[PDB]
Amino acid sequence: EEGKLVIWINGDKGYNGLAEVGKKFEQDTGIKVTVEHPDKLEEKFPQVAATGDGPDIIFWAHDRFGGYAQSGLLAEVTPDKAFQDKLYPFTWDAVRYNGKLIAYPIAVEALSLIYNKDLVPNPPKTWEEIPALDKELKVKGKSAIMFNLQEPYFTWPLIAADGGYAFKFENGKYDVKDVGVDNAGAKAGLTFLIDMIKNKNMSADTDYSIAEAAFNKGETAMTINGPWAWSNIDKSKVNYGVTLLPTFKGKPSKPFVGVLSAGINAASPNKELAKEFLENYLLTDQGLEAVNKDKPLGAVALKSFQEQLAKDPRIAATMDNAQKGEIMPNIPQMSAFWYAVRTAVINAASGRQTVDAALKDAQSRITK
Amino acid sequence: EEGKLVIWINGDKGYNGLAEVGKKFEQDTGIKVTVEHPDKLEEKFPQVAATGDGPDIIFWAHDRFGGYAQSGLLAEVTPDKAFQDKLYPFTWDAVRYNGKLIAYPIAVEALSLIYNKDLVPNPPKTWEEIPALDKELKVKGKSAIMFNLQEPYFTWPLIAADGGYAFKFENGKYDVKDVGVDNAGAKAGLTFLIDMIKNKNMSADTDYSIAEAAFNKGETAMTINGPWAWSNIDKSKVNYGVTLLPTFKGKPSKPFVGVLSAGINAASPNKELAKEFLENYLLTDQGLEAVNKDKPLGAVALKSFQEQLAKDPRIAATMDNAQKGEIMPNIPQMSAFWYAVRTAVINAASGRQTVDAALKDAQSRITK
Ligand SMILES: OC[C@H]1O[C@H](O[C@H]2[C@H](O)[C@@H](O)[C@@H](O[C@H]3[C@H](O)[C@@H](O)[C@@H](O[C@H]4[C@H](O)[C@@H](O)[C@@H](O[C@H]5[C@H](O)[C@@H](O)[C@@H](O)O[C@@H]5CO)O[C@@H]4CO)O[C@@H]3CO)O[C@@H]2CO)[C@H](O)[C@@H](O)[C@@H]1O
Ligand SMILES: OC[C@H]1O[C@H](O[C@H]2[C@H](O)[C@@H](O)[C@@H](O[C@H]3[C@H](O)[C@@H](O)[C@@H](O[C@H]4[C@H](O)[C@@H](O)[C@@H](O[C@H]5[C@H](O)[C@@H](O)[C@@H](O)O[C@@H]5CO)O[C@@H]4CO)O[C@@H]3CO)O[C@@H]2CO)[C@H](O)[C@@H](O)[C@@H]1O
């Protein structure tokens, strides 16, 4: 039924308090909210939603929602980034399935030991001591502990303690044996660069200083650079804009995204001072501003200062290109990648190798 | 040298502005900060830090830091959770290596197209149109574009556009063929439960209602339950505390962590209204409070309301147990896990099966 909301929530939750939220909703909008707590709602939902019925909103712990999403029974949820930042990131992770958010997280639950302060002022720290405690309580006509033995949720914490688990999780990883430096897409893009060189649209010996000087003197119409370069263009005569990289074969250019980072030397005798400087001086609105006014940093990691920068169209363009690209890996094999690709590009642009032979050699260097 | 800070940062960054931050540091603390920008600092650092020298702090894009961390050259950084929440989560991800944070993220960089508004008011959207643009500019003694061709950072966005990549990333995944329901640790914990039953410390037919009534009437000293149960104990005569689950064989009990979640039915004709209710009524301080006063939610996903709850020792204990446990998977196979483990526990506790035969059968159900 359109124009109202039906909600299902389990009978052990605060469904009367939720109903009070629904009354405020109606009072503000006229839309009636009905809260129900059917038994076995988590089993009924897939059966009724598959026929296009059921409630508008279903509450359960997240463990049930991947099965619902796999069957197409859930709408993708569409919160903007402002709303997403209101909730803890790990709670969104709990409701992501196949890369999409498929629920709103509400609350984080875990079992605890609940004890009667007047019967056991000092509750047992070990399971093994509970039988002796029970013996003393049984002479008083009491028992040490009772909990639900019918639902495995309640017995699982004991089963997992010494090593039981449900499914093993394999952390995300880069496959270092698998590299895309000599595939057809890489060759196509490098061939286009070499064809511009052959056509004398560019020169293979152009380096950072040559390109910067040419652009900042008004000799070339465009350049490719990062935020650190903007300060020198500000001081030049050139009125410049910052925008998306050109597309190739209709697809976006994909710049590697770098996070400028400050590491503390493991040999440093000043680790406490380094922490203080970085946390309490550099990573402040005022600290980042002092660096940024020298040479722009780009988008910054500090949420409070980034909010002040996001307005700048140069920063907007930086983040647009960043979102089309990829974060760099931090793995040790990244330097091998860069050394090999550097040689391949210089060899191909200078005619020391074909594009194919250059990128094949780079691929062999990186993976063998 | 102890009692001062030496910083290395690349020569294209704002090292004079960083030096100004270091002057404010000295003025406040008397500790001198020296900022250097050596050439090839990213290659020199591993050579000098391996001998126990080098700078206290090194700046570079994060791609270099996994190699440093792999060689033991970086201190693990130790920000508390308050500081971590000041920076964007994906920037911390960039400086995590083998599960540890090994740098402070500062700024997010990507290349952009920089254009001269007075030479190309409408900059080209495609690479392919740049040669024709260059031809017209060359008759004016100008060129269309110049950028650094010596460093692969600048040519990679074009190489990646049609399909080039560095290393393929494999997303984290649960291995559904690999289940820990019948390993030695699971059997040990379930055997201890069965031994308590045999010893008449517990009864195999105890369910949720029986245990709740017994605890809330003062007949048993302890129970195991979640936040939703606290409201009924508040109303009872019992003075209760909430604490860590007991250990087993010296290891923590590991409760599964559930995120109470609200999904929107894909068949709902009211998806816009559902979004409004959940985002703007339920997921507010006032909305969660109305539910929480009925039956406590536990820790909540909404950062602003959770800050008000974290003070409660019951919530502290909830999160302590949660951190010792595991987040539930959301995969479709989770319901099979629960149905099979439910049968195993009830069969073993009732004597319908041995612990070994029960858990073996559950393992077979879940994985075949
Ligand atoms: O007729 C035979 C049988 O019926 C009855 O048992 C059945 C249940 O009525 C029925 O709900 C179903 O239970 C399944 C459930 O469908 C399944 O999802 C899974 O449940 C998990 C939760 O998914 C998980 O979130 C967690 O639940 C917590 C919850 O997070 C928390 O917020 C609070 O609500 O406590 C919950 C635990 O009670 O863990 C549970 C697992 O414990 O597994 C359930 C099975 O255990 O199927 C039941 C069996 O058919 C009768 O009770 C039974 O006597 C009859 O034999
Ligand atoms: O003597 C032979 C050779 O010497 C010179 O080239 C060498 C360089 O001096 C040297 O620095 C080294 O360069 C490597 C570098 O060590 C390696 O880490 C990798 O560099 C990556 C960055 O790691 C990555 O962050 C990104 O760098 C951006 C950076 O994020 C950004 O903030 C800004 O600073 O621009 C940087 C790009 O310039 O990408 C670079 C890769 O481009 O790979 C480098 C190699 O390309 O080794 C050089 C070669 O030995 C001379 O220049 C050369 O002519 C001589 O032949």
SS3 A105: strand
Atom nearest to A10 CA in ligand 1: 34
B172 phi, psi to nearest 5 deg: -60, 145
> What's B190-220 look like in SS3?
HHHHHHHHHCCCCCCCCCHHHHHHHHHCCCE
B152 and B37 belong to one structural domain: no
| Alpha-carbon gap, residue A242 to B133, rounded angstroms | 18
B314 and B211 belong to one structural domain: yes
SS3 B82: helix
A140 phi, psi to nearest 5 deg: -90, 5
Which of B104, B124, B106, B105 has its CA nearest to residue B114?
B124
Count CB neighbours of A165 within 10 A: 18
- Altogether, the residues listed in chain A come to a count of 368
Experimental method: X-ray
| Alpha-carbon gap, residue B227 to B235, rounded angstroms | 14
Count CB neighbours of A155 within 10 A: 24
> Strand B33-36 vs strand A165-170: parallel, antiparallel, or unpaired?
unpaired
Yes or no: say if B301 and B310 are a contact pair by the CB < 8 Å rule: no
- Report the phi/psi class of residue B254: left, alpha or beta, with left for phi > 0 and alpha for psi in -120 to 50: beta
Yes or no: say if A18 and B283 are a contact pair by the CB < 8 Å rule: no
Is A58 contained in some domain?
yes
B355 and B248 belong to one structural domain: yes
Is B255 contained in some domain?
yes
Question: Across the interface, which of A24, A68, A298 has its CB nearest the CB of B281?
Answer: A24
Chain B residue whose CA is closest to A183: B164
Contact B21 A287 (CB under 8 A): yes
Contacts for B74 with CB less than 8 Å, ≥ 6 apart: A263, A264, A265, A266, B65, B68, B102, B103
Count CB neighbours of A272 within 10 A: 11
| d(CA A155, ligand 1 centre) in Å | 13
| Alpha-carbon gap, residue B95 to A173, rounded angstroms | 15
Is B176 contained in some domain?
no
Tell me the two tokens of residue B106: 């500062």
The response to whether residue B152 sits with its C-beta less than 6 Å from ligand 2 reads: yes
Which of A96, A58, A102, A160 has its CA nearest to residue B257?
A160
A190 and A139 belong to one structural domain: no
Which H helix or E strand runs over A339? helix A334-350
Amino acid of residue B102: I
Question: Across the interface, which of B15, B125, B149 has its CB nearest the CB of A246?
Answer: B125
Q: Write down the residue that tokens 């960039």 correspond to.
A: B94
| Alpha-carbon gap, residue B314 to B301, rounded angstroms | 17
Q: Which of B247, B330, B356, B366 to mutate to test the interface with A (most CBs of A within 10 A)?
A: B330
Which of B296, B320, B291 has its CA nearest to residue B309?
B296
Q: Is B251 exposed, middle or buried (0-12, 13-18, 19+ CB in 10 A)?
A: middle
Contacts for B202 with CB less than 8 Å, ≥ 6 apart: A143, A145, A146, A149, B193, B196
A151 and A235 belong to one structural domain: no
* Experimental structure resolution, Å: 1.6
Domain count, chain A: 3
Tell me the two tokens of residue A91: 């709670």
Question: Across the interface, which of A108, A202, A218 has its CB nearest the CB of B259?
Answer: A108
Chain B residue whose CA is closest to A300: B107
- CATH number of the domain that residue A12 is part of: 3.40.190.10
Q: Which of A101, A128, A158 is the last residue of a domain?
A: A101
Supply angle C-alpha B248, A13, B242, rounded to 5: 35
Is B310 contained in some domain?
yes
| d(CA A44, ligand 1 centre) in Å | 12
Which of A118, A113, A12 has its CA nearest to residue A61?
A12
Which of B96, B333, B174 has its CA nearest to residue A170?
B174
A137 phi, psi to nearest 5 deg: -70, -30
A349 and A205 belong to one structural domain: yes
Beta bridge partners of A8: A36, A58
Q: Write down the residue that tokens 């989770």 correspond to.
A: B334
A310 and A344 belong to one structural domain: yes
Largest CA distance in chain B: 98
Q: Chain centroid to CA A3: how far?
A: 35
| Alpha-carbon gap, residue A41 to A9, rounded angstroms | 8
Is A179 contained in some domain?
no
SS3 B223: strand
A190 and A335 belong to one structural domain: yes
The response to whether residue A339 sits with its C-beta less than 6 Å from ligand 2 reads: yes
Amino acid of residue A169: F
Tell me the two tokens of residue A39: 């038994």
| d(CA A134, ligand 2 centre) in Å | 69
Side-chain half-sphere CA neighbours of A340 within 13 A = 22
Contacts for A127 with CB less than 8 Å, ≥ 6 apart: A158, A161, B192, B246, B247, B248, B253
SS3 A21: helix
Contacts for B93 with CB less than 8 Å, ≥ 6 apart: none
Q: Is A37 exposed, middle or buried (0-12, 13-18, 19+ CB in 10 A)?
A: middle
| Alpha-carbon gap, residue B45 to A231, rounded angstroms | 28
Yes or no: say if B39 and B85 are a contact pair by the CB < 8 Å rule: no
Which of A307, A261, A272, A302 has its CA nearest to residue A284?
A302
Q: Which of B77, B101, B125 is the last residue of a domain?
A: B101
| Alpha-carbon gap, residue A192 to A185, rounded angstroms | 11
B61 and B122 belong to one structural domain: no
The Cα of A145 is separated from the nearest Cα of chain B by a number of Å equal to 4
Alpha helix segments (H runs only) across B126-267: 130-139, 152-161, 184-198, 208-216, 230-235
Yes or no: say if B77 and A301 are a contact pair by the CB < 8 Å rule: no
Which H helix or E strand runs over A45? helix A41-49
Per 3-state DSSP, what percentage of chain A is helix, strand, and coil (rounded to 5)? 45, 20, 35
The helix-helix angle for B334-350 and B184-198 (nearest 10°) equals: 40
A248 and A210 belong to one structural domain: yes
Q: In this structure, is the dihedral angle defined by the CA atoms of residues A39, A43, A45 and A50, taken in order, positive or negative? A: negative
Is B30 contained in some domain?
yes
SS3 B138: helix
Amino acid of residue A101: L
A146 and A217 belong to one structural domain: no
SS3 A286: helix
Contacts for A165 with CB less than 8 Å, ≥ 6 apart: B179, B180, B183, B326
Yes or no: say if A119 and B184 are a contact pair by the CB < 8 Å rule: no
| Alpha-carbon gap, residue A157 to B321, rounded angstroms | 10
Which H helix or E strand runs over B115? strand B112-116
Tell me the two tokens of residue B190: 């379930």
B160 and B207 belong to one structural domain: no
Is A153 contained in some domain?
yes
Give the domain extent around B158. Answer: 115-169
Q: Is B290 exposed, middle or buried (0-12, 13-18, 19+ CB in 10 A)?
A: buried
Tell me the two tokens of residue A44: 């009924």
| Alpha-carbon gap, residue A231 to A236, rounded angstroms | 9
Is B178 contained in some domain?
no
A215 phi, psi to nearest 5 deg: -65, -40
SS3 B159: helix
Tell me the two tokens of residue A166: 């449900």
Count CB neighbours of A90 within 10 A: 14
